[PDB]
Design an enzyme around this catalytic site. Structure first.
Site, mmCIF file in Angstrom:
data_model
loop_
_atom_site.group_PDB
_atom_site.id
_atom_site.type_symbol
_atom_site.label_atom_id
_atom_site.label_comp_id
_atom_site.label_asym_id
_atom_site.label_seq_id
_atom_site.Cartn_x
_atom_site.Cartn_y
_atom_site.Cartn_z
ATOM 1 N N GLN A 201 6.779 7.836 -10.804
ATOM 2 C CA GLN A 201 5.247 8.860 -9.451
ATOM 3 C C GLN A 201 6.897 9.945 -8.544
ATOM 4 O OE1 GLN A 201 1.440 6.469 -9.241
ATOM 5 N NE2 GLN A 201 1.276 9.134 -8.651
ATOM 6 N N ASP B 201 0.563 -1.168 -0.397
ATOM 7 C CA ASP B 201 0.312 -0.234 0.498
ATOM 8 C C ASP B 201 0.835 1.038 0.065
ATOM 9 O OD1 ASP B 201 -2.812 -1.568 -0.078
ATOM 10 O OD2 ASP B 201 -2.704 -0.382 1.616
ATOM 11 N N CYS C 154 -2.940 -0.140 -13.863
ATOM 12 C CA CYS C 154 -2.658 0.763 -11.757
ATOM 13 C C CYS C 154 -3.976 1.572 -11.630
ATOM 14 C CB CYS C 154 -1.147 0.936 -11.254
ATOM 15 S SG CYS C 154 -0.068 2.401 -12.518
ATOM 16 N N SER C 155 -3.059 2.078 -11.369
ATOM 17 C CA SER C 155 -4.806 3.486 -11.288
ATOM 18 C C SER C 155 -4.793 4.560 -11.462
ATOM 19 C CB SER C 155 -5.004 4.092 -8.963
ATOM 20 O OG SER C 155 -6.262 4.492 -8.861
ATOM 21 N N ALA C 156 -3.678 4.878 -11.576
ATOM 22 C CA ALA C 156 -3.609 6.588 -12.668
ATOM 23 C C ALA C 156 -2.897 5.521 -13.516
ATOM 24 C CB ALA C 156 -3.127 7.317 -12.113
ATOM 25 N N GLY C 157 -2.198 4.554 -14.503
ATOM 26 C CA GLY C 157 -2.131 4.130 -14.986
ATOM 27 C C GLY C 157 -0.503 4.896 -15.625
ATOM 28 N N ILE C 158 0.700 5.375 -14.632
ATOM 29 C CA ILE C 158 1.552 5.818 -14.612
ATOM 30 C C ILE C 158 2.878 5.561 -13.579
ATOM 31 C CG2 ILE C 158 0.703 8.123 -15.874
ATOM 32 C CD1 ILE C 158 1.247 9.573 -13.022
ATOM 33 N N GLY C 159 2.372 5.271 -12.471
ATOM 34 C CA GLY C 159 4.021 4.904 -11.776
ATOM 35 C C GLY C 159 4.199 3.958 -11.252
ATOM 36 N N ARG C 160 3.482 2.432 -11.353
ATOM 37 C CA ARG C 160 3.685 0.960 -10.844
ATOM 38 C C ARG C 160 3.655 0.830 -13.014
ATOM 39 N NH1 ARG C 160 -0.500 -1.053 -6.171
ATOM 40 N NH2 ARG C 160 0.195 0.438 -4.864
ATOM 41 N N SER C 161 3.023 1.194 -13.177
ATOM 42 C CA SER C 161 2.490 0.754 -14.962
ATOM 43 C C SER C 161 3.947 1.088 -16.040
ATOM 44 C CB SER C 161 1.311 1.635 -15.125
ATOM 45 O OG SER C 161 -0.145 1.192 -14.876
#
Ligand SMILES: Cc1c(C(=O)O)oc2ccccc12
Ligand SMILES: Cc1c(C(=O)O)oc2ccccc12
EC number: 3.1.3.48
Length: 284
Positions: free
Chosen positions: A262, A181, A215-222
């Site tokens: 991010q 998390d 992911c949630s926003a599609g920029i960090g983990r993605s």
């Protein structure tokens, strides 16, 4: 390994925040005018995360062609990815329309539906074989075929039916279920094992449309997933693997979607993943 020496130089100097801000400063800025039209407000999860006009995926419909999704096309590596937000209650039908129209074989999910006590994306696939989902707005049916639950990830076989033509296709769902998390994983071993399972499936190969990654926003983990995959591919193809510059690859990817990676911790984790993954690229 020069990459690892640089890593050791930034770690010993504790300059991760400085390196990361330099990337933010040099990153591309392109218009996102379609994302900001009033008709599209309920199609965006986050006001500050939008696809550029030049690289956005268009839905094949005359009414409204908009989805929060970008085509990342990596010319030298010969890989393409679609990076998208976690689907919203009113965009789950659009999401599966995109998978159908782009001829994708795989969906890569890097978040849980609930994290930090809040919903990070819609429950957009069926949880039981005998309870299929129908998307009336886009005329699609989705059925769970099988589920394989492992310690760090789940793989699902899904059947997507275009109800207009009665054509069907098998889609593979690769769900990384253990990203913490807060922060990033302590070791990149489980994330690299997962990346290699997606590759071994054929989902990243040029005989299919581009993989869909969210992911949630599609920029960090993605961003971490596509950056690690492209860097390791370039190390395999080049005469001088030592020449792969992770910062330059990241800035090339940021020409196609804003904000990829991010945090300075996500940047350090991406270096660790590429460094550890190379040791197999070295034939080991
Ligand atoms: C980055 C790198 C180096 C180096 O920095 O010397 O040697 C390799 C062999 C295989 C794959 C990657 C590398
Ligand atoms: C993917 C799939 C489907 C389908 O897409 O309906 O049916 C199967 C039976 C056995 C093993 C795999 C599958």
């Amino acid at each position: 390994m020069e990459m690892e020496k640089e890593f050791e130089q930034i770690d010993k100097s504790g300059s991760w925040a400085a390196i990361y801000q330099d990337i933010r400063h040099e990153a591309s800025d392109f218009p996102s005018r379609v994302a900001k039209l009033p008709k599209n407000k309920n199609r965006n999860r986050y006001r500050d995360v939008s696809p550029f006009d030049h690289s956005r995926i268009k839905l094949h419909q005359e009414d409204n062609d908009y989805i929060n999704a970008s085509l990342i096309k990596m010319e030298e590596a010969q890989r393409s990815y679609i990076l998208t937000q976690g689907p919203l209650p009113n965009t789950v039908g659009h999401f599966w329309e995109m998978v159908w129209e782009q001829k994708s074989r795989g969906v890569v999910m890097l978040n849980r539906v609930m994290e930090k006590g809040s919903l990070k994306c819609a429950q957009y696939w069926p949880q039981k074989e005998e309870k299929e989902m129908i998307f009336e707005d886009t005329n699609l049916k989705l059925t769970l075929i099988s589920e394989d639950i492992k310690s760090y990830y789940t793989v699902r076989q899904l059947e997507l039916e275009n109800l207009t033509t009665q054509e069907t296709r098998e889609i593979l769902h690769f769900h990384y279920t253990t990203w913490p998390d807060f922060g990033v994983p302590e070791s990149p071993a489980s994330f690299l094992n997962f990346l290699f399972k997606v590759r071994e499936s054929g989902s990243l190969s040029p005989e299919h449309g581009p993989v869909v990654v969210h992911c949630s926003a599609g920029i960090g983990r993605s961003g971490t997933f596509c950056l690690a995959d492209t860097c390791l591919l370039l190390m395999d193809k080049r005469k001088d693997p030592s020449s792969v510059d992770i910062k330059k690859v990241l800035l090339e990817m940021r020409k196609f979607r804003m904000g990829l990676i991010q945090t300075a911790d996500q940047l350090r984790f991406s270096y660790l993943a590429v460094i550890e993954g190379a040791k197999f690229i070295m034939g080991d």
